[PDB]
Design a protein around this nucleic acid. Structure first.
Ligand code: NA
Ligand code: NA
Ligand code: NA
Length: 326
DNA sequence: CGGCCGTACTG
DNA sequence: CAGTAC
DNA sequence: GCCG
């Protein structure tokens, strides 16, 4: 399916380098180019052809042809020797490019250096100790078990609750880097107060081991980001997200948390070109603005009972989860 | 050239 | 607010 | 990085 593998592998290396260095826009640009290459119907055979692909410009075309005709990309030999370390540091949940840069300027070079000498935020300390477990993508089965665990715990409070694992799991991938469980209820009200009760229950059985983000001093359209671990010998710690939402937002939440991230932003961009706005909450008319183009409030929500409804209103052919990698 | 999805917590 | 993440 |  990817006729340009020999090419996308090389471009991915540069993209990642720019990314870990904080050059976010340059990296986003590469991503869209790389994605466009992956979906191209055949191997790219010329500069002109490459440039013709939406998402690929002169700069990228030039590199593509260089790889195509020589089998290599010289720019790769000129990547700063600091990239591997910056990557290692930003692999720690809670630590981004700014923190990786700080640690590198202070002279740190290994996870051991970070452990013994770096100032760590509460979230980062958790990210560090579970570094390896978090970098390992778990097999689909485990994801299923984690999702079932959350479902049973929630349904024990209200059998009507609907629980759905999204992210890569819903996109049908064989391995998952995390598990995101979306919860709601058909009656449009019984989702209230589930968060608190659900968390304490999961903590009761030792399933939840660490909390990264969880504002339990607020009961509104919530989110929990933490660490879970299935009972039983040898089980690793895994990243678990729990989002509880009202029934009216279910479709957009399902669409957003299923992803991918590239797909979400592409859809949102597309929504704006049609005078609309897409968020994990809803599909609305264009947001309201002030004299100087400043946003002074939300647009009007357009009811979307199902994901199909979002595509319909955007004038786009429906896409199944497995087809949303970008 | 300037904009690049829209939004949720931490400290 | 600046950073990080979904 | 790309695009308009
Ligand atoms: Na192009
Ligand atoms: Na990180
Ligand atoms: Na909605």
């Amino acid at each position: 399916t990817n006729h340009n593998l020999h090419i996308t592998e090389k471009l991915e290396v540069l993209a990642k380098a720019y990314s870990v260095q904080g050059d976010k826009w340059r990296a986003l640009g590469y991503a869209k180019a790389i994605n466009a290459l992956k979906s191209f119907h055949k191997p790219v055979t010329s500069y002109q052809e490459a440039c013709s692909i939406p998402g690929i410009g002169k700069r990228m075309a030039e590199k593509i042809i260089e790889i195509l005709e020589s089998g290599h990309l010289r720019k790769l030999d000129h990547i700063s020797e600091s990239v591997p370390v910056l990557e290692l540091f930003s692999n720690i949940w809670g630590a981004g490019t700014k923190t990786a840069q700080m640690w590198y300027q202070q002279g740190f070079r290994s996870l051991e250096d970070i452990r013994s000498q770096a100032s760590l935020t509460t979230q980062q300390a958790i990210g560090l100790k579970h570094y390896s477990d978090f970098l390992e993508r778990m097999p689909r089965e485990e994801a299923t078990e984690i999702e079932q665990t959350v479902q049973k715990a929630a349904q024990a409070f209200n059998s009507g609750l609907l629980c759905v694992a999204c992210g890569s799991y819903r996109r049908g991938k064989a391995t998952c880097g995390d598990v995101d469980v979306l919860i709601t209820h058909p009656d449009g009200r019984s989702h209230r107060g589930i968060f608190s009760r659900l968390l304490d229950s999961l903590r009761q059985e030792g399933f939840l081991t660490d909390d990264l983000v969880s504002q339990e001093e607020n009961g509104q359209q919530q989110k929990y980001l933490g660490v879970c671990r299935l009972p039983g010998p040898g089980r690793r710690h895994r990243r678990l997200d729990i989002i509880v939402v009202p029934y009216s937002e279910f479709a957009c939440a399902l669409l957003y948390f299923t992803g991918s991230a590239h797909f979400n932003r592409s859809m949102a961009a597309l929504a704006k070109t049609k005078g609309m706005s897409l968020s994990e909450h809803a599909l609305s008319t264009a947001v309201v603005r002030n004299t100087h183009g400043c946003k002074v409030g939300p647009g009007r929500v357009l009811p979307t009972p199902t994901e199909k409804d979002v595509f319909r209103l955007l004038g786009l052919p429906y896409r199944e989860p497995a087809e949303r990698d970008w």
